[PDB]
């Protein structure tokens, strides 16, 4: 239909990278000239539409793919991949915080800076009592959990419904077996339709990449100056090492080619870089794991679980910025406090939601754990400096958050 058909036949990765580079350059240029408000007014809704189109698909691609994803045997294989993915999700985050501590000791973020105290003293952090957090996994209404966001109760109900369906398909009665296979066929048709709409929105994706990274560079790309450049380098070098020294080694020792893995997962990594949402990149992540031959029983359970639980980049970010704040305050922060940093940033990354900007909010817990409260002005002043470039750090940490889920899914699928 004209120039549109000439634009469609271009390969998706090439125009996604073209939108990435032409968003970064245009955003830096327009942000240096004070045109951040014009970008936020005009350019940003073209990326907001992309995040809306990605979040539209999330619930029918979790529920309908996990009901069909109970095609493996119900106790044995699902319990084995649940344990094998929970051990991976804890160990990679516990290494990610330690790599953040190593990179925050190599660099020195907040190397003796002194700063004024005029920012707002934000919020003393209080956690929910953790029996409500666990008891809210079981939903009191499955349709209410499907309508109110709530990926984590939807995982539980979809696992239960799929196990019940595969018990009904082995029944002696004929009407119950035909009804169960008709329900499974309809749910699988919904899942395949959603995987087609993922390919539909990945053609709009270059405009969304351009309009998202241009807005991010226009607002916050010019504030990366001074020691904020040091903490940005200490975060991004740490994320690069979190990929290369953890994920590539764990892919190599399990017989998976890491370069072919990156060639399969580029469409998920470059989407999570700009959308900054590990729960909005979930349809693209499930499409990537579908394309690389992973069976549905592995990825349909491990990826919506890993969208919230496995956050290695958020863990490394909370490991680095805690050292940044404790260096701006002048604290010694001994190894008995660094082990509590390792213990608390893992729980803070587990508790961090997949929306953009939640890691800076959940940083208050790992701040409060070591004896740096957020209520005093001298800590909140240094914490506002991290909130100045939270989006720049979030762009990389979300990509590492999604790459961790994909690496764990591929490793556990190679284990079976
Ligand atoms: C307001 C919202 C406007 C943006 C809406 C864009 C996408 C929403 C969902 C699109 C329908 C989903 C199903 C369409 C579909 O599957 O075909 C997909 C068709 O792709 C599209 O039509 C997306 C069109 C987005 C246009 C992007 C901006 C156009 C700019 C034109 C350039 C200047 C002229 C591709 O599928 P496939 O790779 O050929 O194979 C699929 C195998 N099943
Ligand atoms: C292994 C761990 C599996 C635990 C799966 C449930 C944990 C995620 C639930 C969740 O997102 O709640 C989050 C809980 O955040 C936290 O307080 C950290 C506690 C993590 C749970 C530790 C394992 C139980 C959201 O809390 P909020 O933002 O204050 O509202
Ligand atoms: N935006 C991050 C979470 C965070 O660190 O705030 C993610 O969803 O992966």
Rg (CA), the chain: 22
Alpha carbon 175 to its chain centroid, in Å, reads: 43
* CA 412 to centroid of ligand 3, rounded, Å: 24
* CA 175 to centroid of ligand 3, rounded, Å: 47
Residue matched to tokens 């169960």: 180
Q: Considering only CA atoms, which of 12, 71, 52, 277 is closest in space to residue 191? A: 71
> Could you give the 3-state DSSP secondary structure of residue 293?
coil
Question: Tokens standing for 369?
Answer: 């754990």
Q: Considering only CA atoms, which of 398, 394, 312 is closest in space to residue 94? A: 312
Q: Cβ of 225: how many Cβ atoms within 10 Å?
A: 10
Helix axes 358-370, 312-328, angle to 10 degrees: 50
For 307, phi then psi, to 5°, come to -65, -30
Q: Are residues 296 and 69 in contact, defined by beta-carbon separation less than 8 angstroms?
A: yes
Question: Tokens standing for 307?
Answer: 């969208």
Q: Are residues 288 and 265 in contact, defined by beta-carbon separation less than 8 angstroms?
A: yes
Reported residue count of the chain is 416
Residue matched to tokens 């994803």: 69
Give me the resolution in angstroms, 1 decimal: 3.1
The residue whose CA is least distant from atom 4 of ligand 3 is 359
Dihedral sign computed on CA atoms, order 38, 40, 41, 45: positive
Ligand 1 lined by 52 (C-beta under 6 Å):
no
- Cβ-Cβ contacts under 8 Å for 414 (sequence gap 6 or more): 254, 255, 256
Give ∠ CA 98-101-104 in degrees, rounded to 5.
150
Question: Tokens standing for 4?
Answer: 């549109």
The residue whose CA is least distant from atom 2 of ligand 3 is 398
- Residue 334: C-alpha distances to residues 41, 322, 326, 343 (Å): 47, 13, 11, 14
Ligand 3 lined by 394 (C-beta under 6 Å):
yes
User: What number does the ligand 1 atom closest to the CA of 195 have?
Assistant: 43
Question: Tokens standing for 258?
Answer: 């890491």
- Domain map (residue ranges) of the chain: 12-416
- Residue 261: C-alpha distances to residues 251, 266, 359, 409 (Å): 9, 8, 27, 11
Helix axes 258-275, 282-291, angle to 10 degrees: 160
Method: cryo-EM
Residue matched to tokens 């398909």: 169
CA gap 400, 199 in Å, rounded: 23
* CA 280 to centroid of ligand 1, rounded, Å: 18
User: What number does the ligand 2 atom closest to the CA of 134 have?
Assistant: 6
* CA 81 to centroid of ligand 1, rounded, Å: 35
The residue whose CA is least distant from atom 9 of ligand 3 is 398
- Cβ-Cβ contacts under 8 Å for 401 (sequence gap 6 or more): 272, 278, 310, 311, 312, 313, 314, 354
* CA 393 to centroid of ligand 1, rounded, Å: 31
**Residue from 357, 386, 406 whose mutation best tests the ligand 3 pocket (most atoms within 8 A of CB):** 357
Ligand 2 lined by 309 (C-beta under 6 Å):
yes
Give ∠ CA 7-12-15 in degrees, rounded to 5.
65
* CA 231 to centroid of ligand 1, rounded, Å: 39
CATH architecture of 12-416: Orthogonal Bundle (1.10)
Ligand 2 lined by 350 (C-beta under 6 Å):
yes
Q: Considering only CA atoms, which of 384, 4, 26, 362 is closest in space to residue 217? A: 26
Ligand 3 lined by 359 (C-beta under 6 Å):
yes
> Could you give the 3-state DSSP secondary structure of residue 37?
helix
**Residue from 15, 203, 207 whose mutation best tests the ligand 1 pocket (most atoms within 8 A of CB):** 203
Residue matched to tokens 């990366």: 224
């Amino acid at each position: 239909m004209g120039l549109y058909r000439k634009y469609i036949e271009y390969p998706v990765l090439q125009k996604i990278l073209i939108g990435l580079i032409l968003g970064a350059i245009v955003g830096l240029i327009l942000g240096h000239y004070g045109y951040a408000h014009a970008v936020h007014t005009y350019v940003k809704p073209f990326g907001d539409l992309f995040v809306r189109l990605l979040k539209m698909l999330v619930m029918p691609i979790v529920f309908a793919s996990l009901v069909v994803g109970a095609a493996s045997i119900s106790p044995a294989r699902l319990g084995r991949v649940g344990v094998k993915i929970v051990v991976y999700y804890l160990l990679t985050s516990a290494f990610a915080v330690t790599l953040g501590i190593i990179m925050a000791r190599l660099f020195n973020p907040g190397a003796g800076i002194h700063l004024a105290v005029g920012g707002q003293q934000f919020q003393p952090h209080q956690a929910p009592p953790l029996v409500h957090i666990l008891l809210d996994i079981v939903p009191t209404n499955p349709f209410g959990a499907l309508a109110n966001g709530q990926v984590l109760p939807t995982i539980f109900f979809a696992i239960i419904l799929g196990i019940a369906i595969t018990y009904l398909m082995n029944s002696e009665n004929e009407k119950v077996r035909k009804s169960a296979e008709t329900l499974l066929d309809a749910i699988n048709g919904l899942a395949e339709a959603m995987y087609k709409i993922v390919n539909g929105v990945m053609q709009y994706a270059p405009i969304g990449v351009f309009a998202l990274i241009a807005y991010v560079m226009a607002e916050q790309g010019v504030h990366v100056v001074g020691e904020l450049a040091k903490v940005t380098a200490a975060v991004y070098v740490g994320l690069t090492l979190q990929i290369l020294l953890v994920y590539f080694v764990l892919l190599k020792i399990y017989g998976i080619d890491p370069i072919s893995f990156i060639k399969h997962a580029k469409d998920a990594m470059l989407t999570a870089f700009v959308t900054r949402s590990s729960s909005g990149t979930l349809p693209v992540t499930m499409r990537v794991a579908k394309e690389m031959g992973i069976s549905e029983g592995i990825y349909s359970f491990t990826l919506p679980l890993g969208a919230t639980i496995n956050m290695d980049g958020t863990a490394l970010y909370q490991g680095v910025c805690t050292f940044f704040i404790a260096n701006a305050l002048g604290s010694h922060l001994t190894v008995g406090q660094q082990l509590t940093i390792v213990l608390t940033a893992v729980l803070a990354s587990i508790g961090t939601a997949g929306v953009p900007g939640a890691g800076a909010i959940m940083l208050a817990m790992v701040l409060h754990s070591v004896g740096l409260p957020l209520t005093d002005p001298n800590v909140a002043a240094a914490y506002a400096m991290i909130l100045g470039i939270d989006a720049i750090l979030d762009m990389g940490r979300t990509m590492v958050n999604v790459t961790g889920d994909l690496t764990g899914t591929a490793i556990v699928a190679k284990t079976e």
